[PDB]
């Protein structure tokens, strides 16, 4: 039933809405995140592993957003490690 491709896009898009709201004083942060996502292997972006990662990150972002940049860093790090280049 689960389509990880669409689920990951949903989870990532939900996370970015939080980021947009809470990083408005540093406008370069959000495009950087999109850039990291843009450059990752699309199969990784559609993977169950990425889904699991996004679930944890978004969960932490929702319950404890005082460490948002921590979470942002995790996500950027993971995405860099799966860069298509």
């Amino acid at each position: 039933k689960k389509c990880y491709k669409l689920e990951n896009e949903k989870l990532f898009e939900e996370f970015l809405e939080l980021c947009k709201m809470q990083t408005a004083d540093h406008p370069e942060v959000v495009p950087f995140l999109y850039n990291r996502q843009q450059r990752a292997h699309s199969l990784f972006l559609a993977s169950a592993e990425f889904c699991n990662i996004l679930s944890r990150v978004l969960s932490r972002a929702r319950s404890r957003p005082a460490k948002l940049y921590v979470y942002i860093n995790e996500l950027c790090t993971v995405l860099k490690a799966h860069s298509a280049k």
Partner: peptide
């Protein structure tokens, strides 16, 4: 704070990139 340093580190990486 952990978040402060995380923020500082991310911003520097962006500026460097």
């Amino acid at each position: 704070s952990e978040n402060r340093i995380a923020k500082k580190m991310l911003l520097e990486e962006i500026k460097a990139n």
